[PDB]
Amino acid sequence: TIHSQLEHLQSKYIGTGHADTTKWEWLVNQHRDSYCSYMGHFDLLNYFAIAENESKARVRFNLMEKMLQPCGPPAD
Amino acid sequence: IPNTAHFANVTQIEDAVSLWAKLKLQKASERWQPDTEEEYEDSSGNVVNKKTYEDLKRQGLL
Amino acid sequence: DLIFCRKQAGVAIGRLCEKCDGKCVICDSYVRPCTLVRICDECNYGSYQGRCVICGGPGVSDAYYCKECTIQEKDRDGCPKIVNL
Amino acid sequence: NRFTVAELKQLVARPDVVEMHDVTAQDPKLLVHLKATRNSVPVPRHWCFKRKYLQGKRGIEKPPFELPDFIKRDIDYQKLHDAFFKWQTKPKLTIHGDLYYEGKEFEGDLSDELRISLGMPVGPNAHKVPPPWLIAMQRYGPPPSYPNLKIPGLNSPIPPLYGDVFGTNAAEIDRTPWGELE
Amino acid sequence: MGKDYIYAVTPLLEDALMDRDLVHRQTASAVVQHMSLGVYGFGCEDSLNHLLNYVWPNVFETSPHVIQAVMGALEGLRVAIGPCRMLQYCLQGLFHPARKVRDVYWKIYNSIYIGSQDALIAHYPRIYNDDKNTYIRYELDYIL
Amino acid sequence: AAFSVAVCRFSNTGEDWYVLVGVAKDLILNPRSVAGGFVYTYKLVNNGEKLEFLHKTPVEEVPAAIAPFQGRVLIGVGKLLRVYDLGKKKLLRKCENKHIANYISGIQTI
Amino acid sequence: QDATVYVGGLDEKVSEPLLWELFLQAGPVVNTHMPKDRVTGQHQGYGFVEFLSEEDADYAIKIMNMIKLYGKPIRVNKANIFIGNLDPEIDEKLLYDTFSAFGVILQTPKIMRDPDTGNSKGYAFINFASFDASDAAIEAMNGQYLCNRPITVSYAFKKD
RNA sequence: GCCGGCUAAGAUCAAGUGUAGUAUCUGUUCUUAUCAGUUUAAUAUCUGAUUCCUCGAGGA
Numbered sequence: 001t002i003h004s005q006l007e008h009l010q011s012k013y014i015g016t017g018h019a020d021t022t023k024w025e026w027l028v029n030q031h032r033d034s035y036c037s038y039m040g041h042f043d044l045l046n047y048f049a050i051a052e053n054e055s056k057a058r059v060r061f062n063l064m065e066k067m068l069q070p071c072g073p074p075a076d
Numbered sequence: 077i078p079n080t081a082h083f084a085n086v087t088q089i090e091d092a093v094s095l096w097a098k099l100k101l102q103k104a105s106e107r108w109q110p111d112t113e114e115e116y117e118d119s120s121g122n123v124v125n126k127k128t129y130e131d132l133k134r135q136g137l138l
Numbered sequence: 139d140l141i142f143c144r145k146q147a148g149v150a151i152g153r154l155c156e157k158c159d160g161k162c163v164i165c166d167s168y169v170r171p172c173t174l175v176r177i178c179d180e181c182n183y184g185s186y187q188g189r190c191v192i193c194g195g196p197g198v199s200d201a202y203y204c205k206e207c208t209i210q211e212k213d214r215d216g217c218p219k220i221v222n223l
Numbered sequence: 224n225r226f227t228v229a230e231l232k233q234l235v236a237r238p239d240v241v242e243m244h245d246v247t248a249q250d251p252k253l254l255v256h257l258k259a260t261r262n263s264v265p266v267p268r269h270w271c272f273k274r275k276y277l278q279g280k281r282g283i284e285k286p287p288f289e290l291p292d293f294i295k296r297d298i299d300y301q302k303l304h305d306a307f308f309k310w311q312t313k314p315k316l317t318i319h320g321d322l323y324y325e326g327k328e329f330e331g332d333l334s335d336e337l338r339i340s341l342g343m344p345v346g347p348n349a350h351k352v353p354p355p356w357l358i359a360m361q362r363y364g365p366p367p368s369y370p371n372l373k374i375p376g377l378n379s380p381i382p383p384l385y386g387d388v389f390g391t392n393a394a395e396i397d398r399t400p401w402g403e404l405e
Numbered sequence: 406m407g408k409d410y411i412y413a414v415t416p417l418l419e420d421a422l423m424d425r426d427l428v429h430r431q432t433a434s435a436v437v438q439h440m441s442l443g444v445y446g447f448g449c450e451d452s453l454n455h456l457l458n459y460v461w462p463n464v465f466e467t468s469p470h471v472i473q474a475v476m477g478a479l480e481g482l483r484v485a486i487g488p489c490r491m492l493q494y495c496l497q498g499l500f501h502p503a504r505k506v507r508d509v510y511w512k513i514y515n516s517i518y519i520g521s522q523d524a525l526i527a528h529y530p531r532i533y534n535d536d537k538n539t540y541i542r543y544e545l546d547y548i549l
Numbered sequence: 550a551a552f553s554v555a556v557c558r559f560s561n562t563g564e565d566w567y568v569l570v571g572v573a574k575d576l577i578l579n580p581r582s583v584a585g586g587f588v589y590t591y592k593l594v595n596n597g598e599k600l601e602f603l604h605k606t607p608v609e610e611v612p613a614a615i616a617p618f619q620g621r622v623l624i625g626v627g628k629l630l631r632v633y634d635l636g637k638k639k640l641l642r643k644c645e646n647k648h649i650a651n652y653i654s655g656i657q658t659i
Numbered sequence: 660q661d662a663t664v665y666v667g668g669l670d671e672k673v674s675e676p677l678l679w680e681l682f683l684q685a686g687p688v689v690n691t692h693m694p695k696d697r698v699t700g701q702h703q704g705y706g707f708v709e710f711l712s713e714e715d716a717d718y719a720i721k722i723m724n725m726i727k728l729y730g731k732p733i734r735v736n737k738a739n740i741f742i743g744n745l746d747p748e749i750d751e752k753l754l755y756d757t758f759s760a761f762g763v764i765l766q767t768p769k770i771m772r773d774p775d776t777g778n779s780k781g782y783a784f785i786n787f788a789s790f791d792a793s794d795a796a797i798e799a800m801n802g803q804y805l806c807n808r809p810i811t812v813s814y815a816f817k818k819d
Numbered sequence: 820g821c822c823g824g825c826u827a828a829g830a831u832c833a834a835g836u837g838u839a840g841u842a843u844c845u846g847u848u849c850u851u852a853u854c855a856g857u858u859u860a861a862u863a864u865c866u867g868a869u870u871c872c873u874c875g876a877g878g879a
């Protein structure tokens with residue numbers, strides 16, 4: 001049953017998929033962990049804050065605000 | 077219409093001719109056609125008229 | 139019913155018995171032990187204080203992950219104690 | 224409420240990657256788009272077969288194992304070690320996307336042996352010894368398929384010719400690599 | 406120590422991976438896994454990609470031991486070869502019409518995703534916006 | 550918004566130096582949108598101390614890279630790679646490749 | 660078939676890349692084909708060289724005609740008396756001109772060809788006007804030195 | 820495998836033997852048929868309906 005437990009733990013981790021995963025879930029997952037990776041890495045945030053001419057605190061707050069509904073609301 | 081991988085699993089005539097029109101338009105668009113795509117400035121005024129194509133330049137230099 | 143515990147591991151060190159002394163808990167390899175095993179608090183309590191993580195007999199020495207499991211960061215999951223249901 | 228092959232071929236930017244079953248997917252537009260990514264080798268092609276990935280034909284009966292050339296040329300001292308690490312060559316390797324499948328295992332200069340079997344003598348120092356195919360080229364003219372080819376007697380001088388080289392192709396920078404060991 | 410001997414055993418592993426016997430392919434997969442985790446940071450990616458080209462067709466195997474060895478070899482190649490190559494091998498099957506292909510590919514993808522979730526950020530392919538939803542990541546298109 | 554700059558000489562002209570500046574027009578970053586682009590040309594006179602405007606050539610996308618090349622200039626106009634010669638009223642398009650993937654961010658020539 | 664040239668008269672020293680290497684100076688030979696036998700498993704002396712253009716095949720047929728390759732009369736072409744072991748460089752008109760010195764020919768001769776390539780099989784059949792020309796061919800031509808190929812003339816049908 | 824075919828290309832349902840595990844063998848049958856539903860990437864599968872000829876018989 002070790003394989004079955006692995007199949008239950010892999011499902012538990014947030015961001016994993018399965019044969020019924022849609023395009024929307026996949027894309028919002030990669031957008032969300034992209035925003036978290038931007039918040040983590042110090043020189044990517046530097047790049048963005050120089051590009052759009054904003055303070056780094058403002059870019060961080062904008063990314064956190066975008067975290068809620070990236071890619072718009074779902075289908076139907 | 078040539079036999080290529082694009083025209084596979086296509087069994088009807090009009091579908092084939094329409095997809096051929098589409099592929100023709102796409103490829104003909106994405107090539108580099110120097111005859112109509114080029115900017116020559118003939119020495120007729122030599123400081124004006126850069127809208128000359130590659131054919132009007134020969135007509136002016138003939 | 140050979141299932142890992144996979145709970146948050148604490149400060150308790152995993153133990154191995156005389157039969158399992160050189161073994162790796164995850165892949166059962168014997169080559170290059172690399173990382174000390176940690177177990178959760180419910181696996182280390184009362185009568186469960188010193189016990190083999192593989193079988194459950196009286197522990198005699200420290201349990202280790204192998205270098206192969208350490209490279210793949212398989213020491214970062216929960217408690218690796220084998221628990222039967 | 225599902226596309227047809229020709230209808231979906233009209234929507235996509237790359238119709239030649241569309242296949243029979245592609246119209247039966249839950250999201251064919253994303254499937255065809257991922258099939259066109261500028262990488263990403265395709266599926267192993269035997270998912271729809273019914274022969275368990277091992278074809279029982281093609282005559283797989285063959286030699287067991289051919290060792291490399293370095294294999295053949297105490298048992299051997301550090302000198303034969305030197306030999307094994309001087310003779311070591313890189314084998315043939317396939318690049319990133321070349322998956323294997325059941326079938327894909329079977330599918331002016333002349334050599335000295337052919338010149339010895341044909342009855343042609345060796346090249347002299349200063350004389351004219353043409354091949355018998357050069358008389359037709361001297362009579363009719365140079366071949367239009369290879370105008371840059373040179374033959375001794377017609378375009379190349381007689382003193383040229385050296386060994387088995389009876390012809391040379393004459394086609395009408397800073398190439399040194401940057402960081403390399405000395 | 407194996408970094409000097411991968412070129413010598415590659416044709417033998419090729420032969421063993423083309424074989425019909427199941428133990429042959431299972432053991433060759435085990436060898437690939439141990440070799441991959443043995444050389445890591447030593448620049449042996451050519452032979453390992455070549456061998457992945459022969460290991461990958463075995464993902465549609467029903468025998469449990471063979472598929473276990475194949476998963477082990479894939480997770481070793483995830484470390485030695487990198488997650489970008491693995492994602493490139495999984496992309497076209499993630500959304501296949503057949504449910505078997507989707508199950509296998511999503512298992513492999515989840516294994517690739519749980520380890521090195523952060524690196525995958527730089528490897529995802531571009532996906533265009535539709536009428537309803539925005540999918541382009543615009544920040545990465547900035548040019549200083 | 551200026552994004553590229555180059556100093557070069559053109560073969561059809563003499564030993565005069567020119568400065569080319571690539572400029573975007575009404576660029577939005579998120580969502581990305583641009584109205585167009587321009588290439589400015591200056592003559593760089595008085596022993597390299599003064600710039601004097603010569604003309605201004607419109608392009609349909611942001612020119613992000615400009616590189617001198619064999620007596621002419623290469624320009625990356627968004628996805629497009631073009632060759633440009635100097636003219637009396639604008640820059641004259643000479644050659645073009647249209648198969649580069651997404652967006653040209655740099656051009657280098659040996 | 661037009662861009663490909665059929666070569667005849669190849670010995671055991673000639674191989675499949677050897678013909679492409681020898682025909683590389685004449686033109687861009689794209690592929691070489693050698694049909695293997697069923698009893699021996701080797702080439703029967705006849706092969707094909709598929710080039711890119713028809714002019715290269717014409718130059719190879721006009722340059723490598725009646726050549727002595729590997730001790731064999733190799734020749735390239737556009738892809739009751741019995742004569743055996745004849746050279747493929749000769750044609751029907753050439754065989755009719757060679758047979759006109761002994762006796763008078765009744766009609767144009769015919770040469771057998773392979774069902775796969777169609778250039779030359781190895782045997783031919785020719786009919787004379789009278790039996791005196793057949794006896795002169797069996798006395799003189801049956802064993803005469805042809806173009807690097809010992810031919811053998813024999814009677815196709817004889818009644819005891 | 821041999822020169823498109825000779826039914827060794829697949830599925831299935833009962834029983835026997837045996838392993839830690841995989842398995843191995845026998846009888847079979849294989850719809851030669853149609854429609855509707857389930858389902859399958861598509862098959863498959865399952866769920867239901869559906870007088871004549873010949874020499875007392877057989878076949879459709």
Ligand SMILES: CC[C@H](O)[C@@H](C)[C@H]1O[C@@H]1C[C@@](C)(O)/C=C/C=C(\C)[C@H]1OC(=O)C[C@H](O)CC[C@@](C)(O)[C@@H](OC(=O)N2CCN(C3CCCCCC3)CC2)/C=C/[C@@H]1C
Nearest residue numbers: 157158159160161165166167168169170171172204205406
């Ligand atoms: C596939 C083979 C099997 O799994 C087999 C090992 C096992 O199934 C049997 C059962 C059993 C109990 O008989 C196994 C025996 C165990 C062994 C032969 C291992 O030996 C030991 O346990 C001895 C002890 O635990 C530690 C010795 C040690 C450190 O050498 C250990 O091996 C290593 O860690 N290595 C491997 C790496 N090697 C190099 C050498 C350079 C510097 C040291 C580290 C790198 C050093 C030695 C044991 C090897 C045997 C496989």
Ligand SMILES: [Zn+2]
Nearest residue numbers: 162165204207
């Ligand atoms: Zn381990």
Ligand SMILES: [Zn+2]
Nearest residue numbers: 155158190193
């Ligand atoms: Zn124990």
Ligand SMILES: [Zn+2]
Nearest residue numbers: 143178181217
């Ligand atoms: Zn625990």
